[PDB]
Symmetry: D2
Subunit: 246 residues, 4 copies
């Protein structure tokens, strides 16, 4: 995807799992990849900006800082995988709010402050990823299911409001092999390598593809929707789910 | 609906418009109606309880109270800058979560429990977002609590409500003829060549709350005059 | 429904099961019911007209006849190798097109015309295909004919019908205990821990055909016990 | 997309519009492109097989013939653009059946006879394209809307039945600049270059993108879904519609 080369791409958390796979892809494409998270992902091919995306003030500044640097913002990839930080475990009513903070409001803040700069740039597209926790098991997954659907609605607003200047799309993954899913397995069956393997195999057979997805497979869809190859695709969710939703 | 009679039905924000018409509809049906809002109207037809649904304390208290009075809850109707944005998500979404969270235990033990969430409508952002959130909320509740309790969503388009009457009034002027023309024109966006009536929403809510919809759950009913039929 | 009484309602393939229960439901509602099927039952409650809905000649003739008898049609209920495949698309789809095509002109001039299409269920191919086709058919009709006429779809999952009773019977044996176990097990695929009842479908059809759904069009109502709530 | 190189790809009609753009793409990818239609598309980079896809017997043989040749069938792209042949113009009741023949049954025949051979091959994916006529204007577009939805259902069956061996997906285009759409404009406003231009501009403003799509833009989605990049995507429709459906 030659068009992605040198475009400024912000991934919100690029240390592990999906965020990492995404980050990897755009680097192979030749982007200026910026990592908006609370952790430096170690690799010196991405540039990290210290920010808690649930805090609007931190997002506001961080975005402006990013724009003073690379003088451009093309792609905004909103994603939440192991930056849902607190006590988890279970809890409930404060936990319900915090999951909505991370999985919805972090998407709104990053979007509200990026849009004004993005429209100034070339081929701006925003790609929103649903939580992997959406289809798994009710610890109490209601907040995940809710903020996934919320994120669709958000995607659809942005799409409609900012066409034809800027594009917006959602990627909706099923269960993907990530630190987040490995944790869910562990909370269900403990920390035995075989038992976690067996459980993950079991979740795989829930999908008609008879396996769970790979982060690389969600990286592809994001790259595609952010690419010029998707220049007429906007306001939609692309299901990367191994045919779970059918 | 021969089952709705003497069923306990909580209707949030049942003050005017869509909330009025739904409240009034169950009252027509022989049901015992309780309004959970901040603003109390005049009444003899149905109960009222002062309750800001974005306050979980008040919510919990109010539903506990309701159950102590009636010994039953069969139906719950949840009805609709960054501060303003976060406020809309609080009202349109967090309100539905709090009332649901607290009513459910009581509802699991009552006859034919049914939850019905109404969706809502410069930047329509927080409205659209929360509409979809409510669908997600409906789906998860309906998943977690079947076969004990049913949960469904009504997704109305443009309905003749005071809100919408004003939304035209801001755009063209307070002239009741130009507003009429603006309303008529919005009606033509709908394949049905007209906007909706509050009664027409109240019908769907009453259907989904009754035993008539006993096998229907986790679904949205579009009272939109074909607006989504695209 | 105070409007369904003495309304003219055509119900195709209203012989047994889902078609039985829908026919019977309108008869309960004070409506005047006419069955369009190939096989006639015993009756005094509702009319029958011998009509193979996959034959456009017979269809046209039959609806013309119906209108000449009653001077009105308000409701139409369309109810469900390569040869076999093409035969299913003919029944489940082409049948709905022919009855709709011919009834519509008559319906546009009757009180509150409403069309309701029921979806259906080795290779489930032609069934699934035609289910979606019917949704498309519903949508286009509802688009073309608003605000004159409403058209909507009922999408039922597994319902206790003779068909399904047999579909278990082929798989495990004709033993009425193993069939029961096979049915109970299919019920647990549904979040509601049970398959559906024909009455529960008949309820949705009667709702969508009545004035209660006056602003609802081009939509599918899922009577599936949460099966699609995935 | 290196994985597409040398894979056997059958496009059902590759002379003009979308079918052509598709055909072009996979050739740039390095495929063995086979054209199943009733017209030779002229270009000696595709190989043509004479077949009316609405006739099961012709499809049955043609497919087998194709498999004896290239000994493999990887991709099946079902598409219908100006091979809807008869009198059009309008008509109705026989026209309604014939549109269903072309837009639905041609997809079923090509699929029924390809699947048994496709599963034997590497990374088999079927990509079904909805009619461009779906969203335009009721001459009587009911048959188009119906067979579009029918094609979704078909896609979903195949997906579920043949996972994980074979994948199936739908691409759902809005109005795309094709001979089919240019004809629709012409039937509405006559054969004046300006009037057809104006009308097409008007249809463009119906889409939030303020323009109608390009065949190349539908080519991309097909290439992507047929590609290994979509190896976990199955049973879904990817809307290439400029945000019309939102």
């Amino acid at each position: 995807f030659s068009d992605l080369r040198d475009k400024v791409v912000i991934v919100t958390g690029a240390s592990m799992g999906i965020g990492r796979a995404i980050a990897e892809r755009f680097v192979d494409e030749g982007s200026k990849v910026i990592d908006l998270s609370i952790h430096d992902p170690g690799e010196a091919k991405y540039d990290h900006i210290e920010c808690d995306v649930t805090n609007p003030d931190q997002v506001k500044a961080s975005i402006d800082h990013i724009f003073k640097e690379y003088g451009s913002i093309s792609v905004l990839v909103n994603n939440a995988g192991i930056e849902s930080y607190g006590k988890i475990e279970s809890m409930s009513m404060g936990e319900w709010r915090r999951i909505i903070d991370v999985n919805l409001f972090g998407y709104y803040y990053a979007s509200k402050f990026a849009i004004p700069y993005m429209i100034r740039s070339r081929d701006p597209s925003i790609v929103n990823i649903s939580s992997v926790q959406a289809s798994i098991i009710t610890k109490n997954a209601s907040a995940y299911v809710t903020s996934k659907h919320a994120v669709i609605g958000l995607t659809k607003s942005i799409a409609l409001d900012y066409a034809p200047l800027l594009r917006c799309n959602a990627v909706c993954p099923a269960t993907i092999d990530t630190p987040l899913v490995r944790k869910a397995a562990e909370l269900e069956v403990g920390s035995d390598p075989m038992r976690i393997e067996k459980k993950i195999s079991e979740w795989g057979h829930e999908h008609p593809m008879q396996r769970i997805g790979k982060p690389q497979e969600v990286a592809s869809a994001v790259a595609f929707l952010a690419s010029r190859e998707a220049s007429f695709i906007t306001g939609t969710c692309l299901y990367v789910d191994g045919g779970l939703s059918i």
